[PDB]
Amino acid sequence: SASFWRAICAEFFASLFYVFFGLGASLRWAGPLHVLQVALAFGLALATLVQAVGHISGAHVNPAVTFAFLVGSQMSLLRAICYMVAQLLGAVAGAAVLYSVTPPAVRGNLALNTLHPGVSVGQATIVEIFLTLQFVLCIFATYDERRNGRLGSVALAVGFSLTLGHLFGMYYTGAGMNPARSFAPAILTRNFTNHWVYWVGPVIGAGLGSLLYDFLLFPRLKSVSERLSILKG
Amino acid sequence: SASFWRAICAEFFASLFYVFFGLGASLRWAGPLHVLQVALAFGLALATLVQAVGHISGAHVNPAVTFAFLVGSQMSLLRAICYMVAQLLGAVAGAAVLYSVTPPAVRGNLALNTLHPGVSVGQATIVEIFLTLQFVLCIFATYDERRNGRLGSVALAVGFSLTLGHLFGMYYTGAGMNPARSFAPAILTRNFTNHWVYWVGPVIGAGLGSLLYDFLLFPRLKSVSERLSILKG
Amino acid sequence: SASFWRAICAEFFASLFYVFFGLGASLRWAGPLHVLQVALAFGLALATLVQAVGHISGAHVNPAVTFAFLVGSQMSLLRAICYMVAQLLGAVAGAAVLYSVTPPAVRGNLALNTLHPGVSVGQATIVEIFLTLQFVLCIFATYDERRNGRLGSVALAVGFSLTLGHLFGMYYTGAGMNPARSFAPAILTRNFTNHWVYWVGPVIGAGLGSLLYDFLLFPRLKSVSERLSILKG
Amino acid sequence: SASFWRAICAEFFASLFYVFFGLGASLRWAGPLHVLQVALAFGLALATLVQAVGHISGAHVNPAVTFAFLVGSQMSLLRAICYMVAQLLGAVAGAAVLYSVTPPAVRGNLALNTLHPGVSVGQATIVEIFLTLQFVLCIFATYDERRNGRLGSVALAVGFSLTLGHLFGMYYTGAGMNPARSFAPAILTRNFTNHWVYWVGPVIGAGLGSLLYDFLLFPRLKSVSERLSILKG
Numbered sequence: 001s002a003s004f005w006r007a008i009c010a011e012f013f014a015s016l017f018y019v020f021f022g023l024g025a026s027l028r029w030a031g032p033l034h035v036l037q038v039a040l041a042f043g044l045a046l047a048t049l050v051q052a053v054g055h056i057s058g059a060h061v062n063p064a065v066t067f068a069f070l071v072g073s074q075m076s077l078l079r080a081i082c083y084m085v086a087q088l089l090g091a092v093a094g095a096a097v098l099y100s101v102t103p104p105a106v107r108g109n110l111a112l113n114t115l116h117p118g119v120s121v122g123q124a125t126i127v128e129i130f131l132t133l134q135f136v137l138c139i140f141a142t143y144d145e146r147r148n149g150r151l152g153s154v155a156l157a158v159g160f161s162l163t164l165g166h167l168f169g170m171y172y173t174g175a176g177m178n179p180a181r182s183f184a185p186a187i188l189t190r191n192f193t194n195h196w197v198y199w200v201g202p203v204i205g206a207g208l209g210s211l212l213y214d215f216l217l218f219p220r221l222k223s224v225s226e227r228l229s230i231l232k233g
Numbered sequence: 234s235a236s237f238w239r240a241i242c243a244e245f246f247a248s249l250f251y252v253f254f255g256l257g258a259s260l261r262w263a264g265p266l267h268v269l270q271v272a273l274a275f276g277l278a279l280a281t282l283v284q285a286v287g288h289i290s291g292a293h294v295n296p297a298v299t300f301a302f303l304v305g306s307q308m309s310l311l312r313a314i315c316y317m318v319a320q321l322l323g324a325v326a327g328a329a330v331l332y333s334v335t336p337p338a339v340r341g342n343l344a345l346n347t348l349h350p351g352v353s354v355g356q357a358t359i360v361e362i363f364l365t366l367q368f369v370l371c372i373f374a375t376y377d378e379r380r381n382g383r384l385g386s387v388a389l390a391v392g393f394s395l396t397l398g399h400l401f402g403m404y405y406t407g408a409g410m411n412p413a414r415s416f417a418p419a420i421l422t423r424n425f426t427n428h429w430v431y432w433v434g435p436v437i438g439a440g441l442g443s444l445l446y447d448f449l450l451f452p453r454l455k456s457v458s459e460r461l462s463i464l465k466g
Numbered sequence: 467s468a469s470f471w472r473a474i475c476a477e478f479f480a481s482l483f484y485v486f487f488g489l490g491a492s493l494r495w496a497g498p499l500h501v502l503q504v505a506l507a508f509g510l511a512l513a514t515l516v517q518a519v520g521h522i523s524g525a526h527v528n529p530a531v532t533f534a535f536l537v538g539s540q541m542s543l544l545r546a547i548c549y550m551v552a553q554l555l556g557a558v559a560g561a562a563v564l565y566s567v568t569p570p571a572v573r574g575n576l577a578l579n580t581l582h583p584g585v586s587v588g589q590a591t592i593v594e595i596f597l598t599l600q601f602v603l604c605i606f607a608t609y610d611e612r613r614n615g616r617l618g619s620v621a622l623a624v625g626f627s628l629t630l631g632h633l634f635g636m637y638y639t640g641a642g643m644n645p646a647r648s649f650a651p652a653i654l655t656r657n658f659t660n661h662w663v664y665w666v667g668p669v670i671g672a673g674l675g676s677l678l679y680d681f682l683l684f685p686r687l688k689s690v691s692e693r694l695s696i697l698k699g
Numbered sequence: 700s701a702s703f704w705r706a707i708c709a710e711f712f713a714s715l716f717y718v719f720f721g722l723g724a725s726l727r728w729a730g731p732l733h734v735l736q737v738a739l740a741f742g743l744a745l746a747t748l749v750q751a752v753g754h755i756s757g758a759h760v761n762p763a764v765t766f767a768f769l770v771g772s773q774m775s776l777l778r779a780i781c782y783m784v785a786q787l788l789g790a791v792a793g794a795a796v797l798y799s800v801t802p803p804a805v806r807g808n809l810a811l812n813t814l815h816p817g818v819s820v821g822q823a824t825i826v827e828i829f830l831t832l833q834f835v836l837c838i839f840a841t842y843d844e845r846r847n848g849r850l851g852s853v854a855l856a857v858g859f860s861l862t863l864g865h866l867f868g869m870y871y872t873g874a875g876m877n878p879a880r881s882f883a884p885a886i887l888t889r890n891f892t893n894h895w896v897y898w899v900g901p902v903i904g905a906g907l908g909s910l911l912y913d914f915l916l917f918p919r920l921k922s923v924s925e926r927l928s929i930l931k932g
């Protein structure tokens with residue numbers, strides 16, 4: 001039904017907003033102030049967007065997040081691909097629109113995710129993994145219909161999880177936690193240096209999060225039947 | 234019924250508070266610290282006011298927000314006009330009372346919304362549009378009775394949306410997102426320079442937000458019948 | 467019943483905690499950083515305490531707040547007096563315990579509420595009034611059983627209202643919004659300079675808040691009968 | 700049942716995350732900025748983890764917290780021991796993994812809890828006690844099934860309680876409030892100087908919190924029967 005294309009649209013616009021506001025708030029340099037401010041910006045961007053379209057598409061706005069739900073057998077392979085496609089175009093569009101209204105000199109590299117001189121790509125990949133792992137874990141747990149009438153706003157919980165990822169990570173890798181968010185700055189600045197970290201960390205972390213939740217913490221046992229039936233629809 | 238004049242009163246007082254506390258917290262200059270602090274101040278002012286009178290008038294406290302609900306066919310043309318009237322007088326009053334208790338030298342221009350030297354009014358109008366668009370989108374989605382028992386506090390969600398608007402926007406336009414909030418400082422400092430941006434951006438953004446929500450994301454299909462019946466009451 | 471002395475105890479301990487953590491976090495000087503940090507500290511202290519004992523005593527932890535509920539005919543004159551008595555002793559105790567574990571030199575004046583050189587006591591009284599007014603207004607609205615299943619945490623709403631009061635007020639009067647919180651530092655430092663502001667502003671603001679809510683925004687019509695019956699119990 | 704080993708696993712992973720992100724965000728020095736940022740980091744780490752596994756193990760992720768529930772007769776002596784065991788190994792593991800991905804020079808002492816030169820260990824023990832006391836009090840009150848449909852997110856309430864503990868405490872003792880969180884940095888840096896404070900304060904505070912809640916504020920009267928029956932299972 002049209003109850004599918006609306007979601008794809010939700011994922012496109014939300015991703016454009018997420019990157020537009022996220023990157024926009026990161027322009028400049030610096031420091032606690034800097035980190036604190038950028039951590040809150042991405043976090044509140046997500047909390048806002050999750051309230052805005054979480055009921056419509058589940059507000060993934062993140063390829064690694066969508067990948068998590070795929071292996072978690074909660075969405076079809078067809079939906080996953082489109083979500084990720086919409087997320088990549090949306091992100092690029094947000095970065096594009098951001099570039100068009102931002103004064104040069106302040107533009108910098110459009111907040112491209114970058115490693116710290118003293119951090120190896122191996123350590124950086126492990127960082128991005130842990131960041132995305134606690135992040136996806138919070139998403140799965142709070143989206144789980146099987147629990148709590150005392151959750152409060154799941155939109156904010158997830159947003160603050162993203163903020164926590166930044167408060168810690170920015171010092172190491174600028175905190176990617178999202179392939180699409182990393183990709184947009186890279187494709188427009190023509191700089192794919194160390195970009196592998198920002199696809200690998202999140203995907204693996206997202207993978208370990210889903211697995212850890214569904215197959216150990218609070219098992220959601222699906223029969224091989226449904227798995228394929230779902231991965232198909 | 235009197236269940237109409239109470240709301241108008243709600244919109245008047247809330248607007249006076251919103252501008253009084255919002256502007257008051259913006260006095261001085263500066264920087265992350267500055268932005269972070271002012272972003273939180275406006276955001277918590279709104280979250281507070283939405284809890285205070287959201288059940289009474291819907292706590293619009295914003296002309297662009299009210300305009301959104303008009304074209305969204307959720308209020309009558311009569312209510313909209315009064316809301317906006319109460320919001321403009323309330324704002325001016327808040328700025329007035331703020332001026333009366335604030336020491337000169339610190340008064341400055343009473344936190345008048347201003348463009349960044351390197352930002353064209355065109356880019357500034359597009360910024361204000363995006364700010365108000367994600368803002369109204371969050372308002373519509375969270376006010377929508379058709380969803381979530383996991384929303385948490387809608388008052389805070391909207392407040393944090395406003396904070397996010399500031400964390401990004403202040404650098405560009407000081408972040409207006411609200412004609413009344415922009416108007417009060419302008420009418421009292423007799424400075425309407427670039428004021429057009431602060432009416433145009435929000436109204437258009439607010440317009441694109443409502444449209445995007447009601448006519449694409451989660452359609453609330455009203456028959457031409459009701460539309461006019463509502464725009465009339 | 468004992469369902470009365472537990473509350474008095476709740477108000478005593480909560481007040482000791484509120485002042486202990488509130489004042490403790492205010493030691494030193496300074497600035498956004500300073501204000502932001504102290505605003506959040508008092509705010510989260512209250513949100514925490516409101517969750518801790520709001521179900522037991524309503525977590526007033528504030529004389530002006532209790533006064534609001536008295537004139538609001540929601541508590542007896544006997545309860546009000548004891549609450550305020552417990553709040554004053556609790557506060558002093560918190561400031562006392564704070565003094566005993568804090569290094570001198572850092573102690574300063576134990577975060578005594580103070581006016582800004584350029585702010586007259588008249589302007590300062592009006593500031594404290596507005597601060598306490600939006601504060602009590604948020605308390606009444608969120609405590610009102612007659613509304614919302616979308617409130618979220620009322621504990622946090624009220625806490626953030628207090629934070630907003632500080633983000634704006636600290637620059638003017640250090641933000642009292644609470645006679646007991648102002649009193650404790652004064653009685654122990656033997657400095658009652660301008661102390662009148664910190665009793666007068668809140669009480670009046672608290673008074674205008676209750677009146678504004680119960681007699682205009684969302685009238686809670688009590689017959690003269692009940693009023694006295696309540697003010698008596 | 701396996702509905703026991705999953706919890707132990709929950710407590711292990713959550714503790715590893717808590718310390719990994721908590722300590723990681725504390726690396727460097729400094730100041731409001733520093734404190735504010737670290738306070739929020741620990742706070743959001745907990746809020747995140749409480750949402751992630753609070754429904755599975757109750758998300759204690761803290762020996763003093765678990766001890767509180769033991770004397771509160773809410774868990775068996777067998778569960779308590781394992782929880783604390785999982786929490787200690789998890790913490791050490793988190794600090795270990797943190798060390799492996801962090802650049803030296805920035806590593807410092809891995810955010811080891813430390814006293815302020817002007818604070819005696821006696822004053823420091825009293826500080827840690829008060830910090831953990833308001834903390835456990837908030838945990839008990841918000842976990843109490845006997846109350847509120849207006850709590851909002853208990854995960855966030857507890858997290859913000861931890862943040863408040865840091866906003867005040869870091870200046871005194873770096874804010875331990877958690878034996879496991881203090882232990883991990885100590886065992887790996889081979890520095891147990893003043894470590895006694897970080898086990899004694901929390902345990903006592905946690906003890907006074909439970910007692911204060913269950914035996915005075917909102918008594919949860921258990922017959923000697925059940926107490927032992929519970930402490931046994």
Ligand SMILES: CCCCCCCCCO[C@@H]1O[C@H](CO)[C@@H](O)[C@H](O)[C@H]1O
Nearest residue numbers: 120121122123126129208796798799800
């Ligand atoms: C879910 C997977 C979790 C993996 C946790 C691994 C912890 C050990 C990390 O060792 C680090 O490996 C880097 C190369 O990758 C080296 O450059 C670095 O010096 C070394 O300290």
Ligand SMILES: CCCCCCCCCO[C@@H]1O[C@H](CO)[C@@H](O)[C@H](O)[C@H]1O
Nearest residue numbers: 121192193194195196197198199200203
């Ligand atoms: C599970 C599928 C994961 C796919 C991840 C794709 C990451 C994009 C690759 O970036 C690579 O970075 C290297 C430096 O590190 C560059 O030398 C190389 O030219 C560039 O292509």
Ligand SMILES: CCCCCCCCCO[C@@H]1O[C@H](CO)[C@@H](O)[C@H](O)[C@H]1O
Nearest residue numbers: 097099100101353354355356359362441
């Ligand atoms: C919902 C409407 C969204 C519109 C998005 C428009 C993106 C392109 C913006 O282009 C900008 O236009 C400015 C004038 O307006 C020029 O001064 C500036 O140099 C140019 O880069």
Ligand SMILES: CCCCCCCCCO[C@@H]1O[C@H](CO)[C@@H](O)[C@H](O)[C@H]1O
Nearest residue numbers: 354425426427428429430431432433436
């Ligand atoms: C949908 C209706 C929108 C109405 C918007 C009204 C905005 C107020 C106009 O401000 C204008 O700003 C110009 C500079 O930019 C000044 O030269 C001009 O004198 C001043 O009047």
Ligand SMILES: CCCCCCCCCO[C@@H]1O[C@H](CO)[C@@H](O)[C@H](O)[C@H]1O
Nearest residue numbers: 330332333334586587588589592595674
């Ligand atoms: C609910 C009550 C609201 C009252 C609002 C009053 C607004 C006008 C404030 O005027 C101020 O009065 C001070 C003395 O009090 C003077 O020192 C100051 O120069 C003057 O500007």
Ligand SMILES: CCCCCCCCCO[C@@H]1O[C@H](CO)[C@@H](O)[C@H](O)[C@H]1O
Nearest residue numbers: 587658659660661662663664665666669
């Ligand atoms: C509704 C009842 C309100 C009661 C308020 C009592 C406030 C305490 C008085 O402080 C006063 O401050 C003056 C300077 O301003 C000092 O000169 C004076 O000696 C001191 O006593």
Ligand SMILES: CCCCCCCCCO[C@@H]1O[C@H](CO)[C@@H](O)[C@H](O)[C@H]1O
Nearest residue numbers: 563565566567819820821822825828907
């Ligand atoms: C739940 C228990 C609460 C206990 C509260 C105690 C408050 C009094 C603290 O006195 C302090 O004791 C320190 C040694 O411990 C001395 O070094 C310090 O100079 C002294 O001021």
Ligand SMILES: CCCCCCCCCO[C@@H]1O[C@H](CO)[C@@H](O)[C@H](O)[C@H]1O
Nearest residue numbers: 820891892893894895896897898899902
């Ligand atoms: C309720 C049980 C509480 C157990 C608390 C154990 C705390 C660990 C002890 O740290 C101690 O710190 C001293 C300096 O202060 C060192 O001299 C001593 O060598 C070291 O062992």
